[PDB]
């Protein structure tokens, strides 16, 4: 229901964002999306390039 990094609005928009501690504690707003699935998938790509090998994403790719 709630994706880690995706904020849902009471209108129909979402927002994919990730927390990066390596950047001295700075935010990384990927961008708003149309649904929680699109904003959640975009969060996985930024949480895999920034974290590198293996990472905890809303959609833990493994197939």
Tab-separated table of N, CA and C in Angstrom:
chain	number	residue	atom	x	y	z
A	1	UNK	N	0.859	-1.219	0.000
A	1	UNK	CA	0.000	0.000	0.000
A	1	UNK	C	0.879	1.247	0.000
A	2	UNK	N	1.724	1.373	0.980
A	2	UNK	CA	2.615	2.564	1.051
A	2	UNK	C	4.008	2.194	0.542
A	3	UNK	N	4.440	2.809	-0.524
A	3	UNK	CA	5.788	2.496	-1.064
A	3	UNK	C	6.831	3.341	-0.333
A	4	UNK	N	7.939	2.753	0.023
A	4	UNK	CA	8.994	3.522	0.737
A	4	UNK	C	9.647	4.506	-0.231
A	5	UNK	N	9.314	5.760	-0.123
A	5	UNK	CA	9.914	6.771	-1.037
A	5	UNK	C	8.821	7.395	-1.908
A	6	UNK	N	7.697	6.740	-2.044
A	6	UNK	CA	6.607	7.312	-2.887
A	6	UNK	C	5.582	8.021	-2.009
A	7	UNK	N	5.360	9.279	-2.250
A	7	UNK	CA	4.341	10.016	-1.455
A	7	UNK	C	3.081	10.125	-2.311
A	8	UNK	N	1.950	9.756	-1.777
A	8	UNK	CA	0.697	9.813	-2.580
A	8	UNK	C	-0.103	11.069	-2.232
A	9	UNK	N	-0.795	11.613	-3.195
A	9	UNK	CA	-1.605	12.839	-2.945
A	9	UNK	C	-3.093	12.495	-3.054
A	10	UNK	N	-3.914	13.327	-2.464
A	10	UNK	CA	-5.378	13.152	-2.486
A	10	UNK	C	-5.961	13.675	-3.807
A	11	UNK	N	-5.248	13.520	-4.895
A	11	UNK	CA	-5.765	14.018	-6.201
A	11	UNK	C	-5.439	13.017	-7.318
A	12	UNK	N	-4.323	12.339	-7.235
A	12	UNK	CA	-3.975	11.349	-8.301
A	12	UNK	C	-2.514	11.511	-8.739
A	13	UNK	N	-1.695	12.134	-7.934
A	13	UNK	CA	-0.265	12.305	-8.318
A	13	UNK	C	0.622	11.637	-7.262
A	14	UNK	N	1.843	11.327	-7.605
A	14	UNK	CA	2.754	10.670	-6.621
A	14	UNK	C	4.125	11.347	-6.683
A	15	UNK	N	5.060	10.902	-5.887
A	15	UNK	CA	6.417	11.523	-5.927
A	15	UNK	C	7.472	10.510	-5.495
A	16	UNK	N	8.397	10.211	-6.362
A	16	UNK	CA	9.467	9.245	-6.007
A	16	UNK	C	10.660	10.017	-5.439
A	17	UNK	N	11.071	9.686	-4.245
A	17	UNK	CA	12.223	10.393	-3.615
A	17	UNK	C	13.063	9.381	-2.830
A	18	UNK	N	14.345	9.603	-2.726
A	18	UNK	CA	15.200	8.647	-1.965
A	18	UNK	C	16.059	9.410	-0.953
A	19	UNK	N	16.416	8.768	0.129
A	19	UNK	CA	17.257	9.437	1.162
A	19	UNK	C	18.717	9.039	0.945
A	20	UNK	N	19.568	9.988	0.665
A	20	UNK	CA	21.003	9.660	0.432
A	20	UNK	C	21.855	10.221	1.579
A	21	UNK	N	22.392	9.339	2.389
A	21	UNK	CA	23.238	9.728	3.532
A	21	UNK	C	24.662	10.038	3.056
A	22	UNK	N	25.085	9.405	1.995
A	22	UNK	CA	26.460	9.638	1.471
A	22	UNK	C	26.619	11.094	1.013
A	23	UNK	N	25.539	11.767	0.712
A	23	UNK	CA	25.651	13.186	0.255
A	23	UNK	C	25.493	14.132	1.451
A	24	UNK	N	26.039	13.775	2.581
A	24	UNK	CA	25.927	14.657	3.780
A	24	UNK	C	24.459	14.800	4.197
A	25	UNK	N	23.660	13.793	3.969
A	25	UNK	CA	22.223	13.879	4.360
A	25	UNK	C	21.481	14.847	3.432
A	26	UNK	N	21.320	14.487	2.187
A	26	UNK	CA	20.600	15.381	1.234
A	26	UNK	C	19.449	14.599	0.589
A	27	UNK	N	18.413	15.276	0.163
A	27	UNK	CA	17.259	14.559	-0.459
A	27	UNK	C	17.482	14.396	-1.966
A	28	UNK	N	16.800	13.458	-2.571
A	28	UNK	CA	16.941	13.245	-4.041
A	28	UNK	C	15.545	13.065	-4.645
A	29	UNK	N	14.873	14.147	-4.931
A	29	UNK	CA	13.498	14.047	-5.510
A	29	UNK	C	13.587	13.613	-6.974
A	30	UNK	N	13.296	12.372	-7.246
A	30	UNK	CA	13.354	11.875	-8.649
A	30	UNK	C	12.327	12.622	-9.501
A	31	UNK	N	11.118	12.750	-9.023
A	31	UNK	CA	10.079	13.472	-9.816
A	31	UNK	C	8.697	12.906	-9.494
A	32	UNK	N	7.661	13.656	-9.760
A	32	UNK	CA	6.286	13.152	-9.474
A	32	UNK	C	5.883	12.163	-10.563
A	33	UNK	N	4.979	11.275	-10.261
A	33	UNK	CA	4.546	10.274	-11.277
A	33	UNK	C	3.017	10.266	-11.377
A	34	UNK	N	2.472	9.384	-12.171
A	34	UNK	CA	0.988	9.330	-12.327
A	34	UNK	C	0.390	8.335	-11.329
A	35	UNK	N	1.131	7.327	-10.958
A	35	UNK	CA	0.591	6.329	-9.992
A	35	UNK	C	1.684	5.935	-9.004
A	36	UNK	N	1.340	5.176	-8.002
A	36	UNK	CA	2.363	4.758	-7.007
A	36	UNK	C	3.260	3.680	-7.620
A	37	UNK	N	2.795	3.022	-8.648
A	37	UNK	CA	3.615	1.954	-9.286
A	37	UNK	C	4.722	2.576	-10.136
A	38	UNK	N	4.412	3.601	-10.874
A	38	UNK	CA	5.449	4.247	-11.727
A	38	UNK	C	6.454	4.976	-10.833
A	39	UNK	N	5.977	5.719	-9.871
A	39	UNK	CA	6.907	6.445	-8.959
A	39	UNK	C	7.671	5.430	-8.101
A	40	UNK	N	7.109	4.268	-7.903
A	40	UNK	CA	7.792	3.234	-7.075
A	40	UNK	C	8.861	2.529	-7.906
A	41	UNK	N	8.614	2.362	-9.177
A	41	UNK	CA	9.612	1.686	-10.050
A	41	UNK	C	10.774	2.645	-10.300
A	42	UNK	N	10.487	3.910	-10.420
A	42	UNK	CA	11.574	4.903	-10.646
A	42	UNK	C	12.447	4.966	-9.391
A	43	UNK	N	11.856	4.732	-8.250
A	43	UNK	CA	12.631	4.765	-6.977
A	43	UNK	C	13.617	3.594	-6.944
A	44	UNK	N	13.237	2.472	-7.494
A	44	UNK	CA	14.134	1.287	-7.492
A	44	UNK	C	15.389	1.568	-8.325
A	45	UNK	N	15.231	2.201	-9.451
A	45	UNK	CA	16.407	2.489	-10.324
A	45	UNK	C	17.370	3.457	-9.630
A	46	UNK	N	16.861	4.390	-8.876
A	46	UNK	CA	17.761	5.360	-8.181
A	46	UNK	C	18.316	4.727	-6.904
A	47	UNK	N	17.631	3.761	-6.359
A	47	UNK	CA	18.124	3.111	-5.112
A	47	UNK	C	19.061	1.957	-5.468
A	48	UNK	N	19.225	1.668	-6.729
A	48	UNK	CA	20.137	0.554	-7.116
A	48	UNK	C	21.435	1.142	-7.671
A	49	UNK	N	21.357	2.291	-8.285
A	49	UNK	CA	22.583	2.937	-8.832
A	49	UNK	C	23.313	3.634	-7.684
A	50	UNK	N	22.565	4.222	-6.795
A	50	UNK	CA	23.173	4.940	-5.639
A	50	UNK	C	23.654	3.946	-4.582
A	51	UNK	N	22.949	2.867	-4.395
A	51	UNK	CA	23.378	1.879	-3.366
A	51	UNK	C	24.311	0.850	-4.008
A	52	UNK	N	24.257	0.714	-5.304
A	52	UNK	CA	25.173	-0.240	-5.997
A	52	UNK	C	24.656	-1.684	-5.935
A	53	UNK	N	25.469	-2.575	-5.423
A	53	UNK	CA	25.094	-4.024	-5.357
A	53	UNK	C	24.001	-4.287	-4.316
A	54	UNK	N	22.923	-4.902	-4.734
A	54	UNK	CA	21.815	-5.244	-3.789
A	54	UNK	C	21.327	-3.995	-3.047
A	55	UNK	N	20.043	-3.896	-2.842
A	55	UNK	CA	19.482	-2.718	-2.125
A	55	UNK	C	18.014	-2.995	-1.794
A	56	UNK	N	17.486	-2.353	-0.788
A	56	UNK	CA	16.060	-2.593	-0.419
A	56	UNK	C	15.159	-1.648	-1.220
A	57	UNK	N	14.435	-2.171	-2.176
A	57	UNK	CA	13.538	-1.305	-3.003
A	57	UNK	C	12.081	-1.716	-2.791
A	58	UNK	N	11.152	-0.902	-3.226
A	58	UNK	CA	9.716	-1.288	-3.077
A	58	UNK	C	9.513	-2.540	-3.918
A	59	UNK	N	10.153	-2.579	-5.054
A	59	UNK	CA	10.060	-3.768	-5.935
A	59	UNK	C	11.456	-4.390	-6.017
A	60	UNK	N	11.712	-5.340	-5.151
A	60	UNK	CA	13.017	-6.024	-5.095
A	60	UNK	C	13.190	-6.923	-6.320
A	61	UNK	N	13.662	-6.352	-7.395
A	61	UNK	CA	13.861	-7.128	-8.652
A	61	UNK	C	14.515	-8.477	-8.351
A	62	UNK	N	13.985	-9.535	-8.901
A	62	UNK	CA	14.586	-10.878	-8.672
A	62	UNK	C	13.897	-11.906	-9.569
A	63	UNK	N	13.678	-11.569	-10.810
A	63	UNK	CA	13.016	-12.527	-11.739
A	63	UNK	C	13.394	-12.175	-13.179
